[PDB]
Amino acid sequence: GAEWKSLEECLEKHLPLPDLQEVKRVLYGKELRKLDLPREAFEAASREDFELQGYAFEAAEEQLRRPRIVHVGLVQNRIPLPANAPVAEQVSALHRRIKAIVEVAAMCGVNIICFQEAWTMPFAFCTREKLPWTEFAESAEDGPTTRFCQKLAKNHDMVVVSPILERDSEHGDVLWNTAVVISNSGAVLGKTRKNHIPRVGDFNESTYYMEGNLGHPVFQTQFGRIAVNICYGRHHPLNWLMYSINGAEIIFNPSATIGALSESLWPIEARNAAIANHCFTCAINRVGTEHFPNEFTSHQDFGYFYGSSYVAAPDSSRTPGLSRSRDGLLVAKLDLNLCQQVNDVWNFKMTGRYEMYARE
Amino acid sequence: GAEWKSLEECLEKHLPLPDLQEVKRVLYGKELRKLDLPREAFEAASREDFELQGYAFEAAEEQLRRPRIVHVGLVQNRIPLPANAPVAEQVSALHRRIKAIVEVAAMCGVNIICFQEAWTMPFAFCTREKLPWTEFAESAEDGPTTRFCQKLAKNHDMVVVSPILERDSEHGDVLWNTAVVISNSGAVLGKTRKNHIPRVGDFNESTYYMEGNLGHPVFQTQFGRIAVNICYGRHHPLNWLMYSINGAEIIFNPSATIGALSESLWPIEARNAAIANHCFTCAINRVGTEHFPNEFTSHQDFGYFYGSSYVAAPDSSRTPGLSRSRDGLLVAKLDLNLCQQVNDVWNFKMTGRYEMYAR
Amino acid sequence: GAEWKSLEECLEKHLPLPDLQEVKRVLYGKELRKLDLPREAFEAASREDFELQGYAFEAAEEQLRRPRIVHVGLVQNRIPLPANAPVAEQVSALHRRIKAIVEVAAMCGVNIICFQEAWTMPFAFCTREKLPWTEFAESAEDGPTTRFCQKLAKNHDMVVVSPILERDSEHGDVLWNTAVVISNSGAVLGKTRKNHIPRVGDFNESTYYMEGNLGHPVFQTQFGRIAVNICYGRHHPLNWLMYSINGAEIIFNPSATIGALSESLWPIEARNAAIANHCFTCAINRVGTEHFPNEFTSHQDFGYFYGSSYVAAPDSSRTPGLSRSRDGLLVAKLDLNLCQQVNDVWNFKMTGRYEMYARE
Amino acid sequence: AEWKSLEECLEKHLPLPDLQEVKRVLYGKELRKLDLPREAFEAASREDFELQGYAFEAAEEQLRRPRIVHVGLVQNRIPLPANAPVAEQVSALHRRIKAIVEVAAMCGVNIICFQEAWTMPFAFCTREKLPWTEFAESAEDGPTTRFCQKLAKNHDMVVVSPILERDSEHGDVLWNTAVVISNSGAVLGKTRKNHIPRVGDFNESTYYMEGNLGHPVFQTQFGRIAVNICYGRHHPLNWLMYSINGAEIIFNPSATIGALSESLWPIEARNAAIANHCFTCAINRVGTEHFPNEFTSHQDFGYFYGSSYVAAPDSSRTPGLSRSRDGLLVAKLDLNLCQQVNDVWNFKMTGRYEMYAR
């Protein structure tokens, strides 16, 4: 499934309006209102070859607490250059491509943004080659990508979540799959490492780094607490539970998972985490296909990436997934007030006997 | 919604074959082969006003361990009589209705069967009335429903999971929402109580019983280990995790949840439990609407039941949901060999740092 | 380097006797006396297509403590059947092949024996396929191989070290590279797991198991304390140091490492461990080449195995390596009395400032 | 003693294919021989010292250019008998070292090293304080230190000169210290002897104590270099601690006698290089030392097998120098491969420091 576009587009395209609405209410939860974005921004989306989608999660008004509306952006992009390209050229091209989408998002009120797992480099862990695929790794706190992202952080006052490949040089020049998060002031709020490594098939990610010892950090931004969940950490519900225990409100899931079986798990695990943790969850997956001069046994290509980035809400509602082929950006108008309103009504934490479950 | 039929039927009805197949592969996982059931059995399904669906989960052949094929049946039925009816008449009518479907299932190789939560009585916890809605409760180990089920257990050699309303009389005549499981020999293998009580809206189930102290029992049958998960226990993933820790292979979820928000959670929580526990999970929900002479504030009706019973597999594949209106029976050809094959490949248990999380 | 035979044979074959003796004294330490083995046993070695080598380590007589002479055997064997064969047939063939060599060793006074890493199954971690290469794994405490080894333990009263692939079923059916050690009474003295996993090239061993949590166990036999060091644990000197700290006297190193770079490290790391720990170290590597129907990217073959099994001594002396092509058995007459005699003279433990090194 | 280096004998006897296979088994990989000036080789023939040049190959890095550093290792005998005036012996050794330095300077060498206490014959065996402790002077201000600084600032080569520091400011006590001067001739540091071999002829404990300096690492303009004294070679923990502080090229000036130590010579240094992913150099003096008096573990001090060599993090080593004639080895180090193999072979990371050091 590569040529086929997003599920929502096909369903809207074929079945009639009443049946379409019923299928929407069964699959995507509730028909949330589409975010009213500036028209010219949409024109820019048409010009820059990326799809723009805006949705707003509705919340129940609280007489004592005003809603803390936070606009959240999710960027899924392909590699504009082939994998067999110089590191500097690829990094610069990806920086420009990300910057254009950031410029389009900045004129829409977005406050937090996120990119796919290791957006600065093509996913080359399959080839099991240390050179030159480990040359993309640099120091997370001081790298060209980190400074470039800090440039975009302090001009558009948006929190940027940039997953990278941290080359931990102070402790023996070892690579780590770390996702740095910078505030709107461009000062590195933290760097979450990869807790879980997928040792399956093409995912030969164990031969490049080890499991992250950072644990489950939660980064506090001026808008709201945000966490980062790496690709393979998505599968384990305990990871999401631990992230939500520390108070994380918006959990992002930058991933670079291939199609097929993982495509079926994509609308399931993140939604279940959001439902069972009462915290907004975001799902990010890169689009396109990666080609390599060499072949790897689980071929020149690295399969197809279905993308389909979406954001789930604590009230079982989800944004429609983005297109599976074209790169794009999703703008979700989060209302964190509903996060704890549903948490109180559905006391899954309390009715969940932590003493009876965590102990055994 | 109520009139609208199952999602699979509508999708097959409208979008063309290539798009339908792609949507199937996105939603229902993989296109598993339809179970080859006897033709005359299908005719019986047409005659007895219940839908029959057969699906077979494929598994990877193991050179050392032969596949342990277990056929599993899931029965979702409405109440054939109105709620404001004598207890004996309603119980007898439900016994006959269940027995007919059991007779149809017995000629299809089924080994384990399950019914909706408290199939013997209409869900009346909303009315918050002790009489006569607590009169349906009897002793789980010795009741008319238990003996009737044991009659069906020892003639068709099928494991029967009958959720009932246990009236625990030896310890003060208190009701409990317990689901007795009898073997193929008709001898009460156990009775799992309700660990979680939904204190939400129409679900005024807290004013009838307390949380079950039985914990998380796993019943060992000659075919395979099976557990029972009550309606509200479905929501909490920790319940499914604890059930799968004790070695349960096929976890059933008899529920009587109303439509709307719960309909969205229906294809999500059970599938996620199956994926994150590498054990087959079954989902059962009663069909139809229940009407009462009295009104209750969260009305005469008790909303609509979307049914849509399905079985999920450890390899992210699920059977298509049953029809949302007509009562029916689903026959799933489970292959437990794939349960541990995917568990080994996806070491979610091992890569899941129990020391770092449970502590 | 496949056709070429053992280094010692070539050196003896070409250079004259004085130069050969000088090269021996430079490379193999001291010219230790060859063990006097029964002649008919040698005939059996000729008949059963395996090479037999006997060497005796000399020790200084102690007036108060009599020497605790322990004969040690090291078996290196190929796979007699192709890898693409039924599991039962391959296991039975390997059992018979190992049993024949054990029968030949039993008539030579051997007390402890060891086999290559996972001798029951061909090394197939390169293919990265779960089936049917994980079907060889069984329960370590109760398996066909374990019971078969216990049969050979209690009839020839020899301690058997059988590296296997433990399928830990009681805790979720997970494979582990464990090496069970049974006493002369045939009762499972312990099972050491694999502490270090080589995530390099063809060694795709990380996609089959995790690092062993067993730590560094030392098994006490009626003859002497013995430890087991898995393939990749050989490289790290800290592993050998920790094994020697717990009192281990004879440390075995069953490995299945491929040729080339590892061949250069073979005579280095084990000898250095023996010298810096004052404990006898044994090195075991399987011989032959493994062929697979499928190809794997770091081909049908799994390279060549140089074998060259040898035993090192605390006094910087080593047994000559076995032949690189033909499977064989080495019988070393260990004298543990010299182990602590050299330890006292060379107080590397004491002159090694543990407070100044381990603390930092 | 008469027998020459192992490599020469092997090349001399076995045929080319077998020789190449033995090379690939023993010396790792057949690294390319360094292309040295022809006239320099002529000088090596004239000055009665052997010159050997080898170049360690490294994988090209698109982002980091290779930091090629030429390293020299000088092994020399004592040109005068041990029973000689201190000044005459020191001057003769200065001239002999200076000639080899002049030959090395026209080959691009940046760092050089000498045998342990090259300024004085090894006389710790005799257990006599006089006149064998008269060779000791102040490390920071001595005739040998100033002479070495003269050679440092004219050929811009880092010089590692092991000496016998007479620590006079703290009670006139001798120490076996190895001063390292930069290319600007300014004493970068002085590493003391951490480990003392109290074995047999090595009666080195009756002359000094264990060095309290710890494990210093000297930073030169070319690269970080450490000094490992003779007995510190045996303990792998010493090399591990040196490599922990970031040392890239670890030198091992030693004056160990033949026999058992000859077997440990190609083993311990290579294992340290492999398990630390840092270039290691091994230096041992050549020749035999004779004394008028006899010592019980004789007039002679055994034979010195020399055989100086440099090991690399990728398990490759330079062939050992001749065991009889003094010589100089020029190794073209490429430090870029040092961390390339370190990353691939994460012995540091896969080495559970928490599980071992604790």
Domain extents in chain A: 7-352
Measured between CA atoms, how close is C329 to chain D, in angstroms? Answer: 22
- At position B335, the amino acid (one-letter code) is D
B2 touches chain A (CB under 8 A): no
Measured between CA atoms, how close is D343 to chain A, in angstroms? Answer: 6
Q: Which residues, 6 or more positions from C290, have their beta carbon under 8 angstroms from its beta carbon?
A: C79, C83, C122, C123, C124, C301, C302, C305
In this structure, which CATH number among 1.10.10.10, 3.20.20.140, 3.60.110.10, 3.40.50.1370 belongs to the domain C7-357? 3.60.110.10
8 Å CB contact between D319 and D29 = no
Instruction: Give catalytic residue positions of B.
Output: 117, 194, 231
As to burial, measured by CB atoms within 10 angstroms (0-12 exposed, 13-18 middle, 19+ buried), residue C350 is exposed
Measured between CA atoms, how close is C81 to chain B, in angstroms? Answer: 18
Element (H, E) at C334: strand C328-335
Give chain B positions within 8 Å (CB) of A264. 25-26, 29-30, 316-317
Q: What gap in Å lies between CA B35 and CA B69, rounded to an integer? A: 12
A283 touches chain B (CB under 8 A): no
Instruction: Give catalytic residue positions of C.
Output: 117, 194, 231
Contact flag C130-B341 (C-beta cutoff 8 Å): yes
Q: Assess if CATH 3.60.110.10 describes domain A7-352.
A: yes
Query: 3-state DSSP call for residue D24?
Result: helix
Q: What gap in Å lies between CA D59 and CA D217, rounded to an integer? A: 26
Q: What gap in Å lies between CA D344 and CA A69, rounded to an integer? A: 47
Q: What gap in Å lies between CA B2 and CA B304, rounded to an integer? A: 6
Q: Which long-range contacts (CB under 8 A, 24 or more apart) does B5-12 make?
A: B5/B323, B5/B324, B5/B325, B6/B308, B6/B320, B6/B321, B6/B322, B6/B323, B6/B324, B7/A23, B7/A26, B7/B308, B7/B321, B8/B320, B8/B321, B9/B323, B10/A15, B10/A19, B10/A22, B10/A23, B11/A15, B11/A23
Resolution (A): 3.3
Residue C84: how many other CB atoms lie within 10 Å: 13
DSSP summary character for residue C45: H
Mutation for testing the C interface, residue in B61, B62, B64 having most C CBs under 10 Å: B64
Q: Assess if CATH 3.60.110.10 describes domain D37-356.
A: yes
**Touching partners of C (3+ C-beta pairs < 8 Å):** A, B, D
Q: What gap in Å lies between CA A258 and CA B185, rounded to an integer? A: 48
Q: What gap in Å lies between CA B273 and CA B268, rounded to an integer? A: 9
Angle between helices D38-46 and D86-105 (to 10 degrees): 160
Pairing of strands B287-288, B305-306: antiparallel
DSSP summary character for residue A141: S
Nearest to C87 among B64, B344, B345 (CB): B64
**Touching partners of B (3+ C-beta pairs < 8 Å):** A, C
Q: Which residues, 6 or more positions from D332, have their beta carbon under 8 angstroms from its beta carbon?
A: D34, D53, D54, D55, D56, D68, D70, D71
Query: 3-state DSSP call for residue B163?
Result: strand
8 Å CB contact between D199 and C344 = no
Instruction: Phi first, then psi: give them for residue A69, nearest 5 degrees.
Output: -60, 120
Measured over the CA atoms of residue B134, residue B233, residue A318 and residue A19, the dihedral's sign is negative
Nearest to A174 among D59, D61, D343 (CB): D343
In this structure, which CATH number among 3.60.110.10, 1.10.10.10, 1.20.1740.10, 3.40.50.300 belongs to the domain B7-54+66-352? 3.60.110.10
User: Which residue in chain B has the smallest CA separation from C85?
Assistant: B63
Experimental technique, in short, is cryo-EM
As to burial, measured by CB atoms within 10 angstroms (0-12 exposed, 13-18 middle, 19+ buried), residue B76 is buried
Give chain A positions within 8 Å (CB) of C128. 201, 204, 297-298
Nearest to A297 among C200, C206, C296 (CB): C296
A59: β partners? none
8 Å CB contact between A286 and A119 = yes
Looking up tokens 């690399």, which residue turns up?
D312
Nearest Cα residue to D93 out of D75, D110, D112: D75
Measured between CA atoms, how close is D60 to chain A, in angstroms? Answer: 9
| Token output for D247 | 């040392």
Q: What gap in Å lies between CA C8 and CA B353, rounded to an integer? A: 50
- At position C1, the amino acid (one-letter code) is G
DSSP-assigned states of every residue in D126-182 = GT--TTTTTT-B-SSS-HHHHHHHHHHTTTT-EEEEE--EEE-TTTSEEE--EEEE-
Contact flag D315-C197 (C-beta cutoff 8 Å): no
B168: β partners? B174
Order of strands, sheet of B112-114, starting from the edge strand that comes earlier in the sequence = B51-56, B328-335, B69-76, B112-114, B159-163, B179-182, B190-192
- List the helix and strand counts (H, then E) for chain D: 10, 18
Give chain C positions within 8 Å (CB) of A200. 207
8 Å CB contact between B285 and B76 = yes
Nearest Cα residue to A27 out of B205, B210, B268: B268
Nearest to D63 among A87, A130, A172 (CB): A87
Contact flag D244-C215 (C-beta cutoff 8 Å): no
Pairing of strands B310-312, B305-306: unpaired
**Touching partners of A (3+ C-beta pairs < 8 Å):** B, C, D
As to burial, measured by CB atoms within 10 angstroms (0-12 exposed, 13-18 middle, 19+ buried), residue D186 is exposed
- At position C145, the amino acid (one-letter code) is T
Instruction: Phi first, then psi: give them for residue A262, nearest 5 degrees.
Output: -65, -25
Contact flag D343-A87 (C-beta cutoff 8 Å): no
DSSP summary character for residue B165: -
8 Å CB contact between A180 and A172 = no
Q: What gap in Å lies between CA D277 and CA D270, rounded to an integer? A: 10
Contact flag A201-C128 (C-beta cutoff 8 Å): yes
Q: What gap in Å lies between CA C154 and CA C152, rounded to an integer? A: 6
Measured between CA atoms, how close is B344 to chain C, in angstroms? Answer: 6
Nearest to A86 among D62, D339, D343 (CB): D62
Element (H, E) at A285: strand A280-285
Give chain A positions within 8 Å (CB) of B236. 276, 348, 351-352
8 Å CB contact between D259 and D91 = no
8 Å CB contact between D41 and D51 = yes
| Token output for D137 | 């002077």
